[PDB]
Structure formats: structure tokens, C-alpha cells
Nucleic acid binder design. Structure first.
Ligand SMILES: *C(=O)[C@H](CCSC)NC=O
Lengths: 271, 46
RNA sequence: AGGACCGAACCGACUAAUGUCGAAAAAUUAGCGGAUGACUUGUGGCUGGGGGUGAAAGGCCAAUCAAACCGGGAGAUAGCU
RNA sequence: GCUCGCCGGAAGACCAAGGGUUCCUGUCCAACGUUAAUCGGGGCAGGGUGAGUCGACCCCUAAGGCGAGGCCGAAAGGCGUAGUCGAUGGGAAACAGGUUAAUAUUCCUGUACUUGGUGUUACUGCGAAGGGGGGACGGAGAAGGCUAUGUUGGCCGGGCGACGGUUGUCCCGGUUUAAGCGUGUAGGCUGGUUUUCCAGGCAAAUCCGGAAAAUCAAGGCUGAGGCGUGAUGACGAGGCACUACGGUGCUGAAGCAACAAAUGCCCUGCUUCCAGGAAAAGCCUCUAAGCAUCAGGUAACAUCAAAUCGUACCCCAAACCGACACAGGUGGUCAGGUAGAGAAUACCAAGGCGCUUGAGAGAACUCGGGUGAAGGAACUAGGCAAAAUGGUGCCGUAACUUCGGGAGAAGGCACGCUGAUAUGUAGGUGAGGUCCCUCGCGGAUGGAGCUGAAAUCAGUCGAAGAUACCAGCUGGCUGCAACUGUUUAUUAAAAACACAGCACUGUGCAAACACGAAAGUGGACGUAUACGGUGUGACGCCUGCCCGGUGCCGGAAGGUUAAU
RNA sequence: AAUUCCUUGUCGGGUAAGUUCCGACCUGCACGAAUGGCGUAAUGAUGGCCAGGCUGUCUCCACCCGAGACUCAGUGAAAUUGAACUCGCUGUGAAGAUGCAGUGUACCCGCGGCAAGACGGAAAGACCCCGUGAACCUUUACUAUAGCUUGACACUGAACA
RNA sequence: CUUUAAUGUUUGAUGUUCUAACGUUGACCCGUAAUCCGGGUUGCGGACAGUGUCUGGUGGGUAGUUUGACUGGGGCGGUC
RNA sequence: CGCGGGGUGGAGCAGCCUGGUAGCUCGUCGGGCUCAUAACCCGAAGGUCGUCGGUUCAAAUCCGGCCCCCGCAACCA
């Protein structure tokens, strides 16, 4: 929820947290935990490929189901756990046969509901079925690109895709960004919007928060020396050189989109 | 003041040991230079 | 609870004096700041030369950096001494 | 040998790391030592470093290295799969006492424990490169219960005193004892037992997971410390026998209690918060291919084995790193008494040193300090430096404010000792005995003893009672920056950077971008409430007009236009 | 005003006295809205300023305490250095004389201090200038260029409209 | 001659459809106790994409260099 | 105090570059419309080209001096 904090100390003033008394207070389900080694933006070649990344509280990758292959087997949600990898929340589902497995948590579903998948499966939040068996207009999250690929669209705390057109062997979706793209019909997705929409209002407060969050300080270009950033230079705030990235690449308006292998799928550019 | 050289047998070895040198083309090349000049403390190990 | 307060260990380096062919190629003496954190530290890895790293000074990379060290071009060139 | 002074959260005692014989004995004093030198970390000769249990080696993994094939690349070579290395982590096992010129948890004595080979024997379904459990885990907080250790008392032994008193409720010292085994407590976790079935766990499963029955109530797991035992053994103050007079041979009393109490242990707990907190094997359990006469497995007992390397000394320094016997730097552990909140600080303990030039003289001048008449910033770039303030408790405390502050605002007052209150209080710990008992380390009660705040009252001492060390200077106007923080190692710490927050813009996943001839990685095991780039830099009010020029994006008629 | 040259602008406050400080005046040489504007509690080893306290900073220093400085003993350096029988003065001089001319003055040598000179020691001046020197950095200087992007051919086909 | 006609002829321009090259950082299987790689089935794509030679443009991201002399010191000015 | 540019009816600006020919808006004057003014309409006047001096057939113009006005410079030790 949108909980406010008290200004006892500086830095503690502006803090506002999304604190929920629904999330399981205990440790996670052991058979679904793997270590995830962090590297501060460093590739195999040793260098730093992406800036700003480093530090951060240690994590453990919770394995999640995306493809949700198992179908026709009713399952009940045991509990709602917290995962420091997604902005969403994960639910520790319990299949009828005993195969415990994690899934992304949809909208206000709670620990105890029964959800299933398949093609027989009914139209209810958390349920999964191919979209060609789903009505035009309804909104769906956790959308799959290719049959069997897994589900790669709108799965970040609140995002949700809306089905738009019945194009024969194709279906068309309005993506959260606004862009509208034809995806293959036979793919599968899960009804309802991703929960934790309130994640919008999480305000960190003190700079420190971002540090353990995992991000490092950002240094503006015009403070660097010319020899480092294209902006650089100046006897104190001199400028006027068409803002670019630290690679001379034009920023603040520059279409970099160039695939050509996928123009066939994208109907109308993002709005 | 913390003067530069900090002693470490282990670090010194993996970095400049015989097997460390013998590992790569350049290292093998380096040794060949020492051999002809007739140096005695060829590598530094033990 | 707190990048919360006073304050040793610990880390830091504002001021003053001594030193300035030193006790010492940056310390001592008296005061000083932080001191549960963006903290500090041992051990071991990883990144490398127009390249690395950088809470960015053009600071640092073995007392050496607006382009390191060593060997080699190479007895470079020098209308100057 | 005798006094004296200094450290004592060390200037002490153990280790790593690193040194590499500096250890110890005899012996020499040319050179080394900032002086002499008989001395020495100096030369020379010799001696010294004993391990099934400490550590390494070894089993097993993290970051990361290497990498059969393989993908890729002018060669060289790059990355990476199966694997195989890699501790700073996990995994079996010893404690006490004595002994040397130097070694000891290694040697001797007593007393144990651990992992395997083989065999005898009573028995029994065993079995993986496989499945499951286990290993296996964050920050902060709060006490509860203990021990180290200490204080006091009792006891034992010794003394009665260089100058007044001192058989006394008087003075000095000791008052010690492990691991292991038994015992299973304070306290913590979790409800157990049997039967049937199962689309789950790449196969299989009696194991785990799930679903129902029925059934029983407590079972089981974990776990400090205490009490026995180890131990009618050792240590043991000081005598007794001899002194090579350095020490040695023998001998040997008391050996208990109460309380205070840790940052150590229970606790690789409980509560709680968010930032959501390794891996693998050992170990336990269960099956597959296979083997059933066996083989193997479990338990008792006997026998045998535990290899190899390190082990001396230094280790906050004269031996490491700084060119030196250098005021410097160097991770972890143990850390006593009085006073004190305290690991500050002062004086002391054990233990260790007086810093490897000295002896005088007592001038200016310099350095470190003490004090100063009256005035009290007139000094000066500037109150630079000094002085000054300083503690506990209680009363009391503004403007402005984001309502938390400001605030310890400011400013004051009271603090020693002695007795009484009260032949020591409140409070804490708590034996005897009695009652009970599901019987032991038990449940209540009961209160001796012991320890011991804070306060009031009266008297008294001095100039001064937070007397020493230790220990805020305060207030008002104002610029800049929100704020803790970061930064020019070695003249600049700031108004510079960062920062949460805001805006713009890019990016629909084989993402944009980035490293890279390439493969492949990072981004992200994320997917627009996401990620990158840029610019301002909390919060409050708010953010105007200009598309001429530059740049960016959208457009397509015509002109112009490459290779062909 | 961290911005105002003229300027110590003008008025007022604070002062015996105020080129700084504080509040206003607009005459903004040459502020101004996200290279943000105006405020703002709290914080600051921050800049400026005022008052109180407090004092050797000072008026204007005095005494004492210690470590050197000084003497005796041992050990024992360093920068520097053409040669020296190495005075003042007026002038002269490559234009600032211990050394030249004239004149004055001065017995030979040590010790403890003081720094005016010996254009004193130290570093082939970093400021200035020069060289058809070098080095990095800049852009709508030049010429190329990785990358991005456009088209044609090959990889690369087949049928209809 | 102007620009008209129907049939073949030499090709072009796009638009649709198909698949057999090629892509596949989609599914399952085998090598194989293997998230690498290759092979094989099936799906999605599909002559586009992507790559090589040639070529226009962009291109201080990057590199090599130029940027005069006299001058009552140098710059600015003026000048050759 | 050097360098660049300008000065034109009562006001602000054109034309100056290449010498002959000076224009635009406002302002003024007279008439009309209105009860009167503004507004609006009609018609007309008004210039020494900063001043003096040159070259030329002739100078606002092209050259020079002086005056004024605006802007920039007036730095490095
Ligand atoms: C000029 O300012 C120059 C500066 C010398 S800094 C050593 N002055 C010369 O006298």
C-alpha cells in the first residue's frame, strides 16, 4: 500500500513504502532457489559494458514458471511470496499432483484460490489458455512470443496487454508502451493484469537506498573533462554541442530501431 | 605510510611463477630470453 | 526505526606549530570529522595503455601519467647551446 | 644484587602473513653498532625444530583460471560444453600435569577419543555417474539463564614487628584441578501413529510431495550450564636434605561457601524489518541396471594402520615493508584491581623495558610548557593561536518550522566527609525447614545470610566537593549548497561531485547501447510500473515569448545525384 | 548580487570613526525561469559580519621550567668551491667594484652571535619571446577514416495479377 | 512526320501466393551422466533478412597535419 | 586617447554603393463632414543632405580635415 513515513531524521522524511501485510513472512520454498552471481556491468571480456551497475544486497534467483506447460491439472495457490528480482510478486502455487511451482501473481488474487491452465480452462484471473481461445478485447498479461517460447510481454508489476483484433491465424495486441503488434495466434498467455500496480509510488528517499538497490552514482557529462565525455569541457557550465551519449550518438530524439526482420509484425509504432 | 610492495608468496607465484610463465606463448618466449643470456634465478619460485 | 545524536577502537585529513641537507622522499604534537553504514577490513580473483578505472580531479594505474614501465626502431631529428 | 622511573586495551603474552637460523651454548672483538665494549640479532665452532587428534596434504565447492571435442579468427590466438583446478568457507578425532641451555596439545605420566583394512561371530536384502532430506546461512533489538574471571567470607599455614599503638572484629600468601564418559536440565522447535490411493520428483521407489480415512495424545528433535566421575592422582605455601652456591633430590597442609558478572556461551535461537539475505560433498534415506549359494550390510569383540611436509625464534617489530638497529605502515586472539558509564582516562598486577653517546655549564637566540600586575581584541588580512566552556540530576527554554525540530537553545541551582532515617534502606540474589510429588537437576512456601541504589535530616572541614586526569564556548543577521556522504595519495575538502525527486528521449526482445575483426557475453537468467542516454538536483510557488540560424523528427511532388 | 565597470553609487541601521556587513532605492555597463527562477526548517572542520565570555594576540614585556644551543670526551658528515697576500669611500667601467684611479683607514690569529653584501647556495627561468619544436584538447580548418546508412550484383527460387 | 492499334517478341516496375535455398538466441529426440555444438523430426519465417565486392551520404567517434613574415618586445592594427 | 559606422524637411528612417534625378510615415497649414473635438476625406507647403575645404562638366553621394554621436579595443609579465 501507499504507506507514509515520519520525518524523524533527514533522509527519512520523503520515504514512502509499498508495504504489504499479505506477503509470506517466512523464507522461500527451498527446491526453487538458485544462486545468481552478480557482476557490476561486466561482460566475459572483463570490461564494463553497461555503466552504473554494482553493489547491492545479495539475492537468490527464484525459479519461475513461464511456459506453464502442465495443463488440465487444477491447482490451488498456497501463499504469496516476495521476490527481489521482479517488480511483481510471485505466488507459490501447489499443483494437485504435488509439483510445487512458482508463477507470477496476477491482480488481487489471494492465497487459497484455485487456478488451472489448458484449453478447457475457464476465463478467470491467473488462468492460462491460448489466446485464440480468448475473447477479443479482454486484457491479458504474461504473453508468449512464439509457441513454447515462454511468455515475454507485460510481466512487470502492473503491466497488462489488451487483445485487439482477430486476424485469422494472427492476433493483435496493444502493448503497454502503446505500440500494437501482431503475434501468432497459437501462443498462450494468462488472464488478468499483473498485480502490485502500486509499485509506481515507491519512493526511495536517502541516496543510500539506490545503492543497496544495485545502482551506482551517475556522473553528468558536462561535469566530465572533454577528453572523456563528448560534452565535457567548459570554464564552468559551458555547453551548446547538440546533446549526445558518451559515444557521440545523438540522444534526445534519434530512432535507433532497425531490425528489418521484424517489421512484418509491428503494425503501428508506439504512441 | 603503507609502502608499495606488500609481501605475498602465493600471489607472487601465480603471477610470476614458472608454471605461470610456462603457461603462455609470451611467457615461454620470455624464458627463452633468460636462458640465452644465462641468468641463474630464471623464474622466481621456491 | 533511523545514510539519527555524544563518543573510544577503526577509517579519515580541516586548522596551527615543529620539520623542511627531517625521526620520515608528506610525519610528529595539540586540537578535528564520521564512527550501524553510500561504513570499514583480511584473503583471492577480474579489468590494462589513446587502453583500464573514475560519487569526475583530466585524478590513479608500483615514490613515475594531458597518455606507465622495459626492450627494440635508434647513433630518431635538433636552421639551437 | 639494592633502590628509582615508564607501559600496563600495552612499550605484555599467543598466531597468521612474511622473513629464513635472527633461537641456545662456548668462543673471539679486526669490520658492523652513529660512543667505549668483556656485550650483541656481529665473525667462528657446536647444538637445537619428534604429532592418527594443531595445521598443511586430502574430500568438496564460490569468485575466477584452464579447457577434449566445438564455434570463431590473416598466423599467433579468442570464448566456451563435458570436465578439472581454485580457499578467504563447509568436512573425523586430545585434554591435564611434569620435563630442556633452546622443543612440546608432538617427548614422559594418567586418562581418552576418531576414521578405515582384515578377521571371528550372532545375524540380515544389498546396490549408482541416479531421486529426496540434510548441509544451508541477512540486519537490528530485547532480555532470560549461565561461565570465564573477580570480590568477600570461612578454613589452613606464617607473623606479631627498626619510631608512638598492633592476640586482634589484627597483617601477608594459598585457598587449584581439563578433555572425555554418565546425567538430558534452564530454555527453544514441532502435535504425533497406522492404513489406502496417486496424472509429482528425465527411469524406479517401501523415501520425499500430495489426497483422504481412522486413531492417540503426547511423542519426538535440539540444547548452555550445574551435579557425579576422571581424581585416596596432580598442583600445592613453606620447610627438609645438598649447594657446582645458578639450582637440585625429597617432602608436602587447607583445598569450601556467598555474591557480582561479562561484548564470551545457550544463540549456525526468539521478536521484528526491509534492502529479502552461497555452492558442493561428507552424513541420512530410497530405489535402477545387476547379484542372490554368495557377495555386501548392521552390531559386539580381537588385531592392525593412520602415511608425507610444517613445527626453533621474530610476529604492532632492531629480524616484516619503509636504502639504515628509521618517532612511520602491518590482519585475528587473551585483555586483571581500585575509581569510573566505559575497551576513555589515572594509579597499579603478571610480565616487559629505561628508547646504543655521555659529563658539566645554566648566555643570547630557538623549540615544548607554567604563571602574570591594570586594561581586555587596541594585535591582525582574520580573535591565527591560546585561554575559556566541559559531568550527573532537577527546574526551566524563543524566533522560525516541513511540526520530528531549533535544543544540551539560553540560564540556573544542588554535589565532600560523618551519623541518623535504617546497630544498612528500597531493590536484587536466596540456604534451613515444612507441604506435595507425575521422584529429580522437581513444584510451592519460607525467610537466615550476602550484596546494596537513590534520598531527607543534622553536624563538620577548606578558599575551593563534577576539586586531580577526563570533560560543549554561547548567541544574533546573512550568501551559497538541501541534508549523511565523495573528491585533487604528496600545497586546493569547497559553493566542486554525487544524491533521492523531476522532465525529455531512445528501446516490443536475437531490445536499444556496450566490449569484441568473429564467435560470444553483459544488458537480463530482466522484458515498457523495464532498461539506456541526457539535463536540472530535497520540499514549497512556479517554469513566460521566439522554429529566423544549428540540430533533431515526419513528408513526398518535382529538380539534382552514385555505382550500373 | 558569488553578477554593478563608473563606485567607497544614494538613503537608513549598526560605529567616536564602517572601501566589509544588514535593510531598501532601480541608473540591471553586462540577472532571470530546468545550462532553472524566487524562497526555505534542519545540517556545514563553509564565506562575510556583530555582541557576550575569555584571555600575553596586544599595550609592553617580566620570571621560572625543561630539550638544544655553549665547554670537555668519543664518532663524524653536507650543499659549495678559477686562484687569492679577500677593507671604506668618490668616481670609472659590459652602465650597481674586495681586486681599476685617487684618497682615507687598518698590528697577526681565534671564539660566541647578527644577518647588509659577496648581483650568496639550490633548479641550462615555468613569466616573455623564438624555433617552418612536441604534446594532448577544440570546431560549421584540410585530407582521410571505424561505425551507421543507401543502392546495384552474387548468395538467390517458382507461379499468377 | 505526331502520337495512336492488336499479337508475338526483349525485359522492367511493383502487388499476391507458394517453398526448395537461407535464418530460427521455438518444440521434442540422439550423440550424452551436457543451459556448448552438431545431426534428425515438426512449427514459424522465407527469397525478404543477413553476409561479401562496388557505390552515394553521414561521419572530430578516430587519426595525421596546417594555421606566414616585418614589427623600435608579442598581440590587435596597418602592410607585403 | 586608437579602429569601425552614421549625421537627410519640425520627429524617426530611405536614396549614398556607380556623381546628375532627394522619398516614406508621422507632424503642420487651409477646406469639408459634426451642435464642437477626435476620427475620416480632399488639397498644398516644407530639406542648408553635420561644417569647411577638394576632384569634377557638375558633389547628399567619391577623397580629406575638424565637430558630434554610437559601438569595440585599450591586453601578457
Ligand atoms: C610575473 O608575474 C612573474 C611571476 C613569477 S612567479 C615565480 N614575476 C616576475 O618577477
Amino acid at each position: 500500500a501507499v504507506v507514509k513515513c515520519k520525518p524523524t531524521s533527514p533522509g527519512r522524511r520523503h520515504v514512502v513504502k509499498v508495504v504489504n501485510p499479505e506477503l509470506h513472512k517466512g523464507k522461500p520454498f527451498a527446491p526453487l532457489l538458485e544462486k545468481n552471481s552478480k557482476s557490476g556491468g561486466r561482460n566475459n571480456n572483463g570490461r564494463i559494458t553497461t555503466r552504473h551497475i554494482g553493489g547491492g544486497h545479495k539475492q537468490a534467483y527464484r525459479i519461475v514458471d513461464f511456459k506453464r506447460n502442465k495443463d488440465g491439472i487444477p491447482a490451488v495457490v498456497e501463499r504469496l511470496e516476495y521476490d527481489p528480482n521482479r517488480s511483481a510478486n510471485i505466488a507459490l502455487v501447489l499443483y494437485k499432483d504435488g509439483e510445487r511451482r512458482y508463477i507470477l501473481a496476477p491482480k488481487g488474487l489471494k492465497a487459497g484460490d484455485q487456478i488451472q491452465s489448458g484449453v478447457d480452462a475457464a476465463i478467470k484471473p491467473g488462468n492460462t489458455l491460448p489466446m485464440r481461445n480468448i475473447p477479443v478485447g479482454s486484457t491479458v498479461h504474461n504473453v508468449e512470443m512464439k509457441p513454447g517460447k515462454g511468455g515475454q510481454l507485460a510481466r512487470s508489476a502492473g503491466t497488462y496487454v489488451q487483445i485487439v483484433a482477430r486476424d485469422g491465424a494472427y492476433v493483435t495486441l496493444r502493448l503497454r508502451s502503446g505500440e500494437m503488434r501482431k503475434v501468432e495466434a497459437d501462443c498462450r498467455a494468462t488472464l488478468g493484469e499483473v498485480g502490485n500496480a502500486e509499485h509506481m509510488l515507491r519512493v526511495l528517499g536517502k541516496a543510500g537506498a539506490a545503492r543497496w538497490r544495485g545502482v551506482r552514482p551517475t556522473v553528468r557529462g558536462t561535469a566530465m573533462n572533454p577528453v572523456d565525455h563528448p560534452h565535457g569541457g567548459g570554464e564552468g557550465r559551458n555547453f551548446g554541442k547538440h546533446p549526445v551519449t558518451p559515444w557521440g550518438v545523438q540522444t534526445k530524439g534519434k530512432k535507433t530501431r532497425s531490425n528489418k526482420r521484424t517489421d512484418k509484425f509491428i503494425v503501428r509504432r508506439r504512441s | 605510510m603503507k609502502r608499495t610492495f606488500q609481501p605475498s608468496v602465493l600471489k607472487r607465484n601465480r603471477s610470476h611463477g614458472f608454471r605461470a610463465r610456462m603457461a603462455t606463448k609470451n611467457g615461454r618466449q620470455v624464458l627463452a630470453r633468460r636462458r640465452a643470456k644465462g641468468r641463474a634465478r630464471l623464474t622466481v619460485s621456491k
